[PDB]
Design a protein around this ligand. Sequence first.
Ligand SMILES: CN1CN([C@@H]2O[C@H](COP(=O)(O)OP(=O)(O)OP(=O)(O)O)[C@@H](O)[C@H]2O)c2nc(N)[nH]c(=O)c21
Length: 163
Amino acid sequence: SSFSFGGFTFKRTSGSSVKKEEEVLTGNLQTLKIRVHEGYEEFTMVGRRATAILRKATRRLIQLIVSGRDEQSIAEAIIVAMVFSQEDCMIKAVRGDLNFVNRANQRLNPMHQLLRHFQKDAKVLFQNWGIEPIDNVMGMIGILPDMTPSTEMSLRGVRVSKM
Ligand SMILES: CN1CN([C@@H]2O[C@H](COP(=O)(O)OP(=O)(O)OP(=O)(O)O)[C@@H](O)[C@H]2O)c2nc(N)[nH]c(=O)c21
């Protein structure tokens, strides 16, 4: 029930899943083979600089409530969770080819190639994830694709909590 991904320790608190290999198409129509976890699961994500509560279904991020030291660490947690969710809109935000041949990419599986890609630049990821109107849940705030806080709109499923 415990593992690490992208610098975060994930702790499953509810649900379960089975694993299966699956092919997915990027925004540049490149086929990647990823190990998909099938099932509804809830997690706590614990990093050095941020933590979050994550609820996910098969290839769908349902909710992510993230707190952390500042915008850079909160954004990094959001990126890791978006990649971890394996959502189609994250796969489709890859607009160029993923380099799997360079000697330094020879051991990254596709999940880690995706993570590195969006760690270098997440602008397309955030712009294509989608936004939604939000309500007045005190203690929490919305975050826009450009990472500025908002009390009216937020990246779909994502809220920022005070630390
Ligand atoms: C998306 N993931 C990824 N993951 C876990 O996160 C860790 C790293 O993921 P990964 O590198 O894609 O998979 P891993 O099995 O290590 O490697 P590979 O795909 O090369 O066979 C593993 O312990 C994996 O089981 C997950 N664990 C659970 N429970 N649910 C999930 O949705 C996921």
